[PDB]
Design a protein around this ligand. Structure first.
Ligand SMILES: Cc1cc2nc3c(=O)[nH]c(=O)nc-3n(CC(O)[C@H](O)[C@H](O)COP(=O)(O)OP(=O)(O)OC[C@H]3O[C@@H](n4cnc5c(N)ncnc54)[C@H](O)[C@@H]3O)c2cc1C
Ligand SMILES: Cc1cc2nc3c(=O)[nH]c(=O)nc-3n(CC(O)[C@H](O)[C@H](O)COP(=O)(O)OP(=O)(O)OC[C@H]3O[C@@H](n4cnc5c(N)ncnc54)[C@H](O)[C@@H]3O)c2cc1C
Ligand SMILES: Cc1cc2nc3c(=O)[nH]c(=O)nc-3n(CC(O)[C@H](O)[C@H](O)COP(=O)(O)OP(=O)(O)OC[C@H]3O[C@@H](n4cnc5c(N)ncnc54)[C@H](O)[C@@H]3O)c2cc1C
Ligand SMILES: Cc1cc2nc3c(=O)[nH]c(=O)nc-3n(CC(O)[C@H](O)[C@H](O)COP(=O)(O)OP(=O)(O)OC[C@H]3O[C@@H](n4cnc5c(N)ncnc54)[C@H](O)[C@@H]3O)c2cc1C
Lengths: 394, 398, 394, 398
């Protein structure tokens, strides 16, 4: 099931969580960068080797092994960072790991693995429906030695971070000899390149997410980068984005299971601390049944997350397409519902700064959109099902 | 069936909304945006004042109060629906919460002195008020849990307790508080007027809703009551009458929120359809993706259902009073917030990432509806009351 | 609101229900025709004038007036018949009333109004998706004096009834000079015409519905009818079906409100007669909340039914298109849910012959399909909404 | 992780299903159809017998019982899923309810004489049995309500009471009943073997499920117990042990139903996709209407969820026993029937009018799943148990 290394590392992560991270929550909870405790915590994690756990080729962990670890990190908003496991940097690391040239890795992959710099992924554009990636019009043109980039991007997570020195950008390479689906490319763009302008931060229900901060509109005004900044090859844009978003999708879902287990904990502590109409709240059967329904949902999605991870292990993330889609739909909406019941049990306190539930709700709502909206994944599953259904009849 | 006056005033409100209020939205929003989460800005820009004055001149003012407006509850429901389409519209006609409820409490139960002193300034929009019932340390959905102490020595009352979620306390104009506390007796609760500048009243901190502080109506505060002494004549109606008065005020409170919510929904669906026609994904406009189409249709169905149920309730209040319409108010209080919540959430989804952003009012709209499943009584509590009432009526008929 | 006549007639229907119909339920409940009591009951209704109430031009009732009456009939499975208000005969009467020639009315409309014969509507075909009416391929061809009909029809309700002497049939009149949407016609076909063959009955969850009996596959094998049997004109098929199904749709929904009010009654009687875990069942809060949710749903749909009726009164059934669609979607699924909770409260008894809930569930499930499936109505509403939404911006 | 034997036997079952069982479905159905609602036909056509014999020869028999099959619960779950795709498949491998539960009750608690007399013939498929717990006159979901009287005079027991929903009683082979009654004592319930031919046992009437009588497994009966006398040695295990034994049997009962339901669902989704490709409406195949597409996708998601949760539960039973897996069995008992119910209902909708007709197995499939939200314990009861267990585990960890 789990590997022996996987079991040991999980045990180590749990200890670290209980003994260092969680005791630091109060303070960290109570400007687009991170307080010094985050740094001391990172250093400690490095020493005990709890670092880059998300990357098999470095961690020596299977995706099954990591799922249980990632679940644990999901119980705390700054946990993934401490182990260098946070988005959008994990996906960006994977992109370079799988497709980067040797020069590209020496320059960017190494610093990222070290936690020296951060990065942002730039795909979504305000002026076009970006859920259909073929709509992307951010222009990339080629003169002999270099590429010129022009366009608008938004929702770039993490751009506010002064350490964010590098951007991975998806654009159109208009080419008349290639087909409609081979019209896009991925290119490295250093944040300090002339013509790169960060315009404004974007809120999520009036959170700005300063801590991971944040989410930005970035314009690309005549930016020139060396041809050697292109990733893999011209026309390979969609391929690379599929390569990175597969893990991206699954890491978010693993974390969500931990999020949910935290919500249900908060829900039960609360339902026992409050007397209304001469009964503790858990004695009102409707509240009881929310607790129960939440337990059922968590088990279902943890299992479906594990199934997906196990597919990746044995098929690679392309071959696990269907299972990743399934968990990407299931997880955020189920956990969203759990958080919302938890908020309801907490009364007015549920929407307040006094609990982490309102934040938790914002995170889960957004995951029905980020890394691809539910509806898009559902259509992909329907297509895939109808193919498999056709196969079994041949 | 609407009244003739009701029809005329509705027409007037529509012609004010289109011609004055809505064209001011762009600017008022730019003000709301810059001041959200401000430590110190809890009031309104001058346009709100100019707008209020204009409304006074045309008589569009205090429309929510029959004994002043000469309007039925049915008449107002349609009007309030229209105000719901803009976050500052109810204020312009002096129809905003928590002030409408507080005014009604004084109108029905206030002594002549109490009215002359507080009801009058509120009716002019000179001051504002806040209602103080909810307490952090006890489950306040069961009102009998309220422990905020009220004790009596001859000429006065002494008040000690904690209150929170007091809406509007941050606005400097908020000079008066209506408070619910325990008056221990044999053989438990009272409502009392407390001026905000009374020694011992301390405003502790603002409270956020998904990280919105609601500065514009601002906002929602924890208030402590530390040995505050008020005149015995500040008591409303009588000792032991707390629950009665809160029922008296929250009935309309509940229904006014629902009426506004119908307008909120209609606005979401408009935003949803404009958007669904402006975006091409996978070689179609988004409304051509049948799943989106069916959210539009499901929305229309839900609005019609809840508008009618709002009207049914209003019509009950007209012919039964708000005590006799208990059941119908409960029904709409449950139905409306959750339905419109769902409509807003689909509208957000249709808008993509923009739907949670500051570029649309949907994220705010969602927060408002979410909070209405809690404020003025949580769904679960109203459901239980309906079940009890249903089983009584069910017993009656057999 | 209601008219004075409407109020009086409702009062009369309630009395009749309580005093004659309902006391007969036991027996009628405890072969495709009806027992003699049904006949004696019909005769009594005629004498007191409680007959054809569904038809304004005869009853002098508004659609609002009838909605409340139809609601009352919905509380008993044989009630609509007693007042001559049952489908498919009401729709068939309306079709002749609005579009029949004088000869056609003298021959068919009169007997039906009298309750002497019954009729069936034949639109749905097994071999094509009949929810898109343009798919209908049942052939209608013309030689000089007469029409020849060839095709298959199924789900013809009431065909088993020995009194069913007449069929209203929707077929294709292939005509090269008309457009795709003008290719269909409606034609009267007497059941005893050579070439008309009733093939087999169809069950609904293994009910055959003998009482209204039933639902049949009918084949049309070279049937010849006089040209004067055509309704209104060649090419007008869709128009006539819209003309008849509008009321059809709304009458079914009115009846459903009464059905629901019966289910909730059964649910509450039961929830008070049963002690489980030391409490009556209504004291288990989850059961309480089903009762409450059911009350809420009934009020919503009764109101939406009334809104629809009131539109018909003031706009005609074409102009009320949108409101009829809205209630057609809302009603059957909501009431379906109420019946299903009622079944759950009744335990094993809920699915049994000992209650009318299992039948009630079958009726409501089927109304999500008959007179047009939910999905089709939802699409129509979306189209209409987007038009109205466009209007308000001009 | 499956065992090697488990893998081999699964392969065999698949190769029997495709080659013998499924090709017999057409005919067996024609038999089911003609005999549904028959007053007097409660047994099975001869092909079922030939099929049973063939299975015996290849060893595909009693697969549900580890101590005989040598299979783990995980191993069987996959097998039972396969049986679920055909209404007569579990019988062919002697894996049908209520007989599997009754066999387990004797296997775990039966005395040597009891086994030799009843367990043996059942294991051969010579006789059948029925379980008698539910009583019409009391809410039987709370087992302590059972009033069916059992009294003791020296050498024997006297039984008086009403029972209903006794599945299979109509089949002539049903020679034995396992009965739960009250043994009044201080300081309440017992299980007792009752042969069907005992004087005083009267089968009253069959019960329908949406007007299906279930003749094939036939069927479900009300049985009265009018002064029936049995030997004291007919008691199972001991006086006072009723609840224990019912828990002992219903644990597997619950889980076997769920495993079969996964196969039921997979069959619905297959029917749904074949249909959605065979019908053109509004110029598209039905799967091209995005709403239908999303029901297909939602179905796939639900199946994977419940299969995994079934496997999790099975794996618990393997490592904890069925008492120690209480929680996980409860979870799957709630989750499975309602999810698959929804899948079947969407499949019906996709099929149009045909979906409620005798031309498809969907209407039957719906009835089966609906009944599983009641049988072996209603959802609501299992939900409450989960809540209680969750709050205990939640207390443990803190
Ligand atoms: C907190 C947050 C962080 C983000 N971080 C990043 C980032 O780091 N990098 C980045 O490139 N982007 C990022 N995004 C944005 C993002 O991923 C997109 O918003 C998402 O992919 C949808 O793009 P869109 O806003 O253009 O929606 P649109 O393309 O305009 O579509 C909007 C809605 O249409 C519907 N829809 C689309 N197609 C179909 C269909 N076939 N059938 C039925 N319905 C359909 C969906 O409901 C969809 O949400 C982030 C977004 C949020 C909220
Ligand atoms: C934006 C906002 C503005 C507000 N403004 C005001 C104001 O102006 N004045 C004021 O006095 N208060 C105000 N409040 C707060 C308020 O009304 C309460 O939060 C709410 O009514 C319940 O109080 P509580 O937090 O104590 O919930 P609790 O009483 O602790 O109960 C918590 C949860 O238990 C559940 N529950 C309770 N009883 C039952 C039952 N019998 N059966 C099943 N479930 C049950 C409910 O789901 C409930 O939400 C405001 C709140 C918000 C969010
Ligand atoms: C109890 C009962 C009585 C009946 N009585 C009559 C009668 O008296 N006369 C008569 O002519 N018919 C009658 N019918 C049948 C009937 O009305 C049809 O079955 C219904 O119109 C659908 O036709 P169909 O069976 O061909 O479904 P299909 O056309 O093959 O379509 C099946 C399913 O496709 C889906 N669908 C269709 N279009 C869309 C879309 N645009 N988008 C998304 N989903 C879509 C729906 O879910 C639909 O149900 C009766 C049916 C029942 C169950
Ligand atoms: C097809 C079929 C086959 C069957 N076969 C058998 C058999 O072979 N042997 C046998 O002994 N029985 C059998 N039964 C019947 C059976 O199991 C019962 O019907 C069921 O377990 C409950 O019994 P009841 O009808 O008395 O429901 P009740 O006990 O009267 O309770 C009714 C409803 O109340 C609700 N409820 C109960 N407790 C609570 C609570 N604490 N909180 C909230 N809600 C609550 C539930 O929703 C429940 O369904 C069969 C039933 C069917 C439909």
């Amino acid at each position: 099931v789990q590997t022996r290394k996987g079991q040991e590392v999980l045990i180590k992560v749990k200890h670290f969580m209980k003994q260092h991270i969680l005791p630091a929550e109060k303070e960290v909870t109570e400007k687009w960068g991170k307080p010094l405790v985050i740094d001391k915590l990172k250093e400690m994690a490095k020493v005990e080797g709890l670092w880059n756990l998300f990357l098999p080729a470095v961690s020596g962990l299977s995706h099954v092994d990591y799922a249980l670890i990632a679940e644990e990190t999901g119980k705390c908003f700054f946990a993934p960072d401490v182990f260098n496991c946070q988005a959008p940097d994990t996906g960006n690391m994977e992109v370079l790991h799988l497709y980067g040239s040797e020069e590209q890795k020496k320059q960017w992959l190494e610093p990222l693995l070290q936690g020296n710099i951060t990065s942002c992924f730039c795909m979504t554009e305000p002026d076009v429906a970006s859920s259909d990636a073929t709509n992307i019009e951010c222009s990339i043109q080629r003169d002999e030695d270099s590429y010129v980039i022009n366009g608008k991007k938004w929702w770039s997570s993490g751009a506010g971070n002064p350490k964010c020195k590098i951007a991975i950008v998806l654009g159109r390479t208009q080419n008349t000899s290639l087909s409609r689906h081979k019209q896009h490319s991925m290119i490295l763009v250093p944040m300090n390149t002339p013509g790169v302008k960060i315009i404004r931060p974007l809120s999520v229900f009036g959170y700005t997410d300063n801590f991971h901060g944040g989410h930005f509109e970035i314009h690309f005004n005549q930016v020139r980068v060396p041809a050697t900044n292109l990733i893999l090859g011209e026309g390979r844009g969609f391929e690379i984005s599929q390569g990175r978003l597969g893990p991206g999708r699954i890491h978010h879902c693993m974390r969500t299971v931990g999020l949910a287990e935290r919500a249900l904990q908060i829900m039960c502590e609360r339902a026992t601390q409050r007397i209304a109409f001469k009964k503790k709240l858990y004695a009102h059967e409707v509240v009881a049944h929310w607790i129960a329904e939440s337990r059922i949902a968590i088990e279902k999605i943890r299992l479906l997350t594990l199934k997906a991870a196990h597919s990746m292990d044995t098929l690679g993330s392309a071959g696990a397409k269907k299972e990743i889609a399934m968990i990407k739909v299931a997880a955020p909406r189920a956990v969203s519902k759990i958080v919302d019941w938890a908020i309801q049990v907490c009364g007015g306190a549920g929407v307040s700064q006094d609990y982490p539930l309102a934040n938790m709700y914002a995170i889960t709502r957004v995951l029905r959109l980020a890394d691809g909206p539910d509806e898009v994944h559902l259509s992909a599953i329907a297509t895939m099902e109808l193919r498999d259904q056709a196969k079994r009849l041949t």
